[PDB]
Structure 1
Amino acid sequence: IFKPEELRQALMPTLEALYRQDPESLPFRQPVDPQLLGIPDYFDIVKNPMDLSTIKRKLDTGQYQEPWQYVDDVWLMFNNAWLYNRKTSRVYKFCSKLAEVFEQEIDPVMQSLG
C-alpha cells in the first residue's frame, strides 16, 4: 500500500517530463474549453476529459492510491486527444510526441514501484 508522498516523489518526474515538451504540452496544460474553442461536440465525444493540470493536482493532493491510476489518467488524456482530433492536426501529432516521451519515462519508474 503506497503513501501519497511516495507516489508523488516517484511519478512527478514523469509528469514534469511532459510539461517540458514546448510547444507540444501547451494544449494539454489546462482542460479543453469547448466554448473557447468553438467545438460544441467535444463533450459528446470525450466523456471523461483529462489534462496535465488535473493530473498534477491529483498527484499533489494525494488522489491516487496506486500507480496504475496515475498511468490511466495520462493515457486518458492522450486517448481523448487521439479520439477527438484528426490525424492531420497539430494537437494529434503533439499528442503522439508526448505519448512517445511518456512511454520512455514511465517504464523504469513503474518497475521500481510495482
Structure 2
Amino acid sequence: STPIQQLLEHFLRQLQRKDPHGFFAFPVTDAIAPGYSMIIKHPMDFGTMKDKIVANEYKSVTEFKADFKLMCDNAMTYNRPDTVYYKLAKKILHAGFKMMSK
C-alpha cells in the first residue's frame, strides 16, 4: 500500500505479462525440474516476489530488481542454452531491466 509497494506491484504485473506460460509464476520444484534443489541454492519466482511485496520486504526498486535477476540467473544456470527456459530468462531479464530504468 506504500508508494514502493504500489510501484513494485506495477512492475510485477507488467513483468508477468512477459511470461504467459507461467514458467516463472511459482517455485520450480524437483518434480518439475529433476535435481533442481541440489543445483540452485536461492530459488526465486514471481509468486514469492508478490509475497515479498505484500509483506513489505522490498524497500527499494534495486532490491526488487535483484530478486528478479536472481530468478532469471537461476534459470540460466540450471537450464542449458537451447532450452525455452534459458531463452525466456534472457529475454525477460532484458525487458525488466529496460522497464525499471525508464
Per the normalisation by structure 1, the TM-score is 0.81
* Structure 1: distance between partners of 2:4 and 2:11: 11
Could you say which structure has the greater relative contact order, defined with CA pairs below 8 angstroms and 6 or more residues apart?
1
- Give the AA of the match of 1:63: E
User: In structure 2, what is the equivalent of residue 75 of structure 1?
Assistant: 69
Q: Aligned with 1:83: secondary structure? A: helix
Matched, 1:8 2:5: yes
Deviations 1:84-103, CA, capped at 9 Å, x for gaps: 10000001111112112101
Q: How do residues 29-48 of structure 1 correspond to structure 2 at under 5 angstroms?
A: 29-34=25-30, 36-40=31-35, 42-48=36-42
User: In structure 2, what is the equivalent of residue 88 of structure 1?
Assistant: 82
* Structure 2: distance between partners of 1:56 and 1:91: 21
The structure 1 residue matched to 2:43, chosen from 38, 43, 49, is 49
Structure 1 unaligned spans of 5+: 109-114
The structure 1 residue matched to 2:100, chosen from 89, 92, 106, is 106
* Structure 2: distance between partners of 1:28 and 1:22: 7
CA displacement at 1:65 relative to structure 2: 2.3
The structure 2 residue matched to 1:27, chosen from 23, 28, 35, is 23
* Structure 1: distance between partners of 2:32 and 2:59: 34
Per the normalisation by structure 2, the TM-score is 0.89
Count of residues in Structure 1 that have an aligned counterpart in Structure 2: 102
CA displacement at 1:50 relative to structure 2: 0.3
> What is the identity percentage for the equivalent residue pairs of Structure 1 and Structure 2?
30
- RMSD across aligned positions (CA): 1.6
User: Which of the two has greater helix per residue?
Assistant: 1
| Larger Rg computed on CA atoms | 1
